[PDB]
Design a protein around this ligand. Structure first.
Ligand SMILES: *[C@@H]1O[C@H](CO)[C@@H](O[C@@H]2O[C@H](CO)[C@@H](O[C@@H]3O[C@H](CO[C@H]4O[C@H](CO)[C@@H](O)[C@H](O)[C@@H]4O)[C@@H](O)[C@H](O)[C@@H]3O)[C@H](O)[C@H]2NC(C)=O)[C@H](O)[C@H]1NC(C)=O
Ligand SMILES: *[C@@H]1O[C@H](CO)[C@@H](O[C@@H]2O[C@H](CO)[C@@H](O)[C@H](O)[C@H]2NC(C)=O)[C@H](O)[C@H]1NC(C)=O
Lengths: 48, 97
């Protein structure tokens, strides 16, 4: 994974385009995604 | 005497605005209405409108080109009527303002 550049990313079929940055969202285990109001992923967990 | 009454009146205006917050309901209502309209406009994106899924990349990634158009047409009609509703209500509210 390359960070801080626009990329087309595909995490477990969840696809999209955007800038991936290191995050301070302290979400507890067995949680994978985040969500905004429009219910589109805002943060994600690296599978590997 | 008139100068003293005027000064006291100004002081009372200052105290009234400092204490009572509800004085600016007329402006706060406009701000709330615009924020509410945009909130509903955004929330409309999470609706299927009949399609298999409300996110467009899942439809594009799952189904073949000859079949995607039914689901995409459903989403496009739904989102288009949502955007027209927003625009019309904004036009009316702007006329009032
Ligand atoms: C029209 O209405 C005005 C008020 O709406 C009247 O002005 C008031 O008139 C009197 C005397 O000028 C005062 O009202 C009361 O006065 C007593 C005693 O006065 C003493 O204490 C005050 C306050 O320290 C002082 O300013 C005076 O010089 C005296 O030493 C006070 O105990 C009361 O609290 C109350 O103030 C006011 O001084 C005065 N008001 C203002 C804003 O100047 C005016 O008299 C009315 N016109 C007529 C023709 O009656
Ligand atoms: C395959 O995935 C596994 C996932 O466990 C990798 O094993 C470790 O994973 C942890 C966190 O998931 C990381 O420390 C490293 O990715 C792995 N550990 C070490 C010491 O490298 C495993 O590495 C992956 N396969 C390859 C070839 O990297």
């Amino acid at each position: 994974l390359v960070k801080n550049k626009c990329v087309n990313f595909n995490f477990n079929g969840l696809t999209g385009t955007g800038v991936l940055t290191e995050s301070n969202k302290k979400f507890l285990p067995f949680q994978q995604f985040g969500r905004d109001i429009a219910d589109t992923t805002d943060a994600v967990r690296d599978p590997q | 005497l008139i100068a003293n009454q005027f000064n006291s009146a100004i002081g009372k205006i200052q105290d009234s605005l400092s204490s009572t917050a509800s004085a600016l309901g007329k402006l706060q209502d406009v701000v709330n209405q615009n924020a509410q309209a945009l909130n509903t406009l955004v929330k409309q994106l999470s609706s299927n409108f009949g399609a298999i899924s409300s996110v467009l990349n899942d439809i594009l990634s799952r189904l073949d080109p000859p079949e995607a158009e039914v689901q995409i047409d459903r989403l496009i009609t739904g989102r288009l009527q949502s955007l027209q509703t927003y625009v019309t209500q904004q036009l009316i509210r702007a006329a009032e303002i």
